């Protein structure tokens, strides 16, 4: 399935060295400005060695820059695309308090947030309401990721940008929520 199909996304890693990965169904898209074929559809099983679909993902800011992929009750930890030894692990064992079957996750420019239904959890290396602390973000999200100064929340075929300093959905034109394909990816018309 093409990156620019306009279908919803399942998960995104965090922006690392100008690149990230999007997940949809059985597909991994590497989003990098440098790519020869940018957003070439690769199978998750071929790139990451695990079955899709994946629930959520995040990448850590630190120099190792480990990527975490979540599916059901388990998570996998990667370095330079290689699975670390003794993964997968149980979410319950690695992330005390975090539930199974998360909707989305992001790591902040060290804090990770997990999203499930109307709630989110803060994890550092007690649930709160998304719409209370993330001003403009609706209850439930499909996926999330962190940039340098903003975070992005994905819901169906649309997304929100939240400024980190104010934790408010930014005022833009046309307003959030708006098309991922058109305004986030800059897909061809």
The site for Cl ion (CB under 5 A) is made up of 11, 56, 104, 143-144, 147-150
Q: What is the DSSP string of 28-92?
A: EEEEETT-SSTT--EEHHHHTSS-S--SEEEE-SSTT--EEEEETTEEEEEETTEEPTT--EEHH
With CB cut-offs between 5 and 8 Å by kind, which of Cl ion, Ca ion, Na ion, none does residue 149 bind?
A: Cl ion
Q: Annotate 127-151 with DSSP letters as a single string.
A: -EEHHHHSBT--S--SEEEE-SSEE
- Comparing CB distances to Cl ion, the nearer of 11 and 31 is 11
Task: Report the residue from 3, 9, 10, 12 that binds Na ion according to the rule CB under 5 A.
Answer: 12
Contacts of 33 (CB under 8 A, 6+ apart): 18
User: Residue 70 CB, nearest distance to Ca ion (Å)?
Assistant: 8
Per-residue contact flags (x/-) with Na ion for residues 24 to 63, judged by CB under 5 A:
---------------------------------xx-----
What the block records as the tokens of 108 is 């902040």
For Ca ion, the closer CB: 64 or 101? 101
Site residues, Ca ion (CB under 5 A)? 10, 103, 142-143
Contact positions vs Na ion (CB under 5 A): 12, 57-58, 105-106, 144-145
């Amino acid at each position: 399935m093409e990156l620019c199909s306009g279908k919803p996304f399942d998960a995104f890693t965090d922006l690392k060295n100008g690149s990230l990965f999007a997940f949809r169904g059985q597909y991994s898209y590497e989003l990098d400005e440098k790519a020869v074929r940018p957003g070439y559809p690769k199978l998750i099983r071929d790139v990451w060695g695990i079955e899709g679909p994946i629930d959520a993902a995040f990448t850590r800011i630190n120099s190792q820059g480990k990527t975490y992929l979540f599916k059901g009750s388990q998570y996998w930890r990667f370095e330079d695309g290689v699975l670390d030894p003794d993964y997968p692990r149980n979410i319950s064992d690695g992330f005390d308090g975090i539930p199974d079957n998360v909707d989305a996750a992001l790591a902040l420019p060290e804090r990770v947030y997990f999203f499930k239904g109307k709630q989110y959890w803060e994890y550092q290396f007690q649930p709160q309401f998304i719409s209370r602390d993330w001003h403009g973000v609706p209850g439930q999200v499909d996926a999330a990721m962190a940039g340098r100064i903003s975070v992005f929340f994905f819901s169906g075929d649309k997304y929100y940008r939240v400024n980190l300093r104010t934790r408010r959905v930014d005022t833009v034109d046309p307003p959030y929520p708006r098309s991922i394909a058109q305004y986030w990816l800059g897909c061809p018309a």
